[PDB]
Amino acid sequence: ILFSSILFSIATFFSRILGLFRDVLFAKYFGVSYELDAYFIAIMFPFFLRKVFGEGAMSSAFVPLYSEKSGEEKDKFLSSVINGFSLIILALVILSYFFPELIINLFGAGSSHETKILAKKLLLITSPSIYFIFLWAISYSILNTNNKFFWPALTPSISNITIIIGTFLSTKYGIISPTIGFLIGSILMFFSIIKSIIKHKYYFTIKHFPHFLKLFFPTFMTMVVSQINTVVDMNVVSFYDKGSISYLQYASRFYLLPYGLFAVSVSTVVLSKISNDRKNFNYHLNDALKTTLFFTIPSMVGLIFLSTPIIRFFYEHGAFTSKDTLITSKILIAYTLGLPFYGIYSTISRSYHAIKNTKTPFIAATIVSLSNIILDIIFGLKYGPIGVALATSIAGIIGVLYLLFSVKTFPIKDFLKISLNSLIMLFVIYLTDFTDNEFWFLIQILIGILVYLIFSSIFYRDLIRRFLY
């Protein structure tokens, strides 16, 4: 019980790190190059189709129906879905083989001819991955365990790991080794839970699939729509320069690290403060806003200031050059500007959904999406990755404008207090940054956390109570 808990906790910790480590080795071995651009396009095909057919989609739409039924009907339904979707996916693979240029142009229209040719070959390698991802995803979604520790929960990492291995091998075989890794990963991922899926009897049927597609259409629509912004981002960026896409992905790792970090801790607090009851909506919205602001603002100041040390430490090794760190840092800065705004946006949207208000959040998301697309065209087409990141951030701002004017509430006093604290922290860090040590920035961050926490502790009687709650 104890030893198992320990080992599993270790592995689970490594799950979160493998993404970062993959990105790092991408930098070290390939840096920013047209080959890596081609790789990103080729994997972007199954990444999109994964968003449609992945474990998220199965847990949203398939798992409820499977769970409803039981006995023979359950197995026949499972078989029917695996068959129908296997057919669909097979058709998409075939369509990819015969018309690669269509897909490539779809995800990377503005790249050079060599990038597109390479992407075509790599696409040949990566198109089958979606089939095994689907088998794994549906087989993984139907698991129900009495045991405390879910060991299959580490399966998603397998793919990454294999790619990592492929990356280690690039020196001997070039970009194709990562690509192959990708493919093999998916296959292995499937195999990892084959023993599970075998247990179910196989029925050669498709009897009730069309009805399942009718029930699945909403899920599909939503997933595609969420990908639209990303695809647009990628095309705009691809136009600019050799290696623009790679720049965008390197910056993307740290784009979302604040969102990811906040999810684990901030989201529980903020959500709890968001209240379902419609009578106390405004007060609890203000409370939750105070929490959101408290965490977001200082992190934006900090991350913006320490962009270059962080990016340098994590990426600059190997093929990644100083100039690459420079441009990547710029992109991270532009994107970071939005963090406070979007955090606010998410809090408000949450609240509205909590009181069952769909219209206003929908219109907010529509505004953000359309402003982001237009601003990508305006800025990104001229200035590339940095332009697209800036466009994204500004779109966040516009969204917050609509939302704030709708709710008509904001803890401006507490906001200003927070902000001042953040600024004085920034000042301290400015003084500390004169020393030029490479690893100095970790210490800078520890210091900065303590600076902000000290001044905030001075301002608020109970530090934990007010925001941590």
Curated annotation (Swiss-Prot):
Gene: murJ
Periplasmic face of the membrane: 22-33, 98-121, 170-173, 237-247, 307-330, 382-384, 436-438
InterPro entries found in the cross-reference section: Lipid_II_flippase_MurJ/MviN, MurJ
Protein keywords: Cell inner membrane, Cell membrane, Cell shape, Cell wall biogenesis/degradation, Membrane, Peptidoglycan synthesis, Transmembrane, Transmembrane helix, Transport
Function (record text): Involved in peptidoglycan biosynthesis. Transports lipid-linked peptidoglycan precursors from the inner to the outer leaflet of the cytoplasmic membrane.
Name of this chain's protein: Lipid II flippase MurJ
The keyword Protease belongs to this UniProt entry's keyword annotation: no
Membrane topology, record value: Multi-pass membrane protein
UniProt source species: Thermosipho africanus (strain TCF52B)
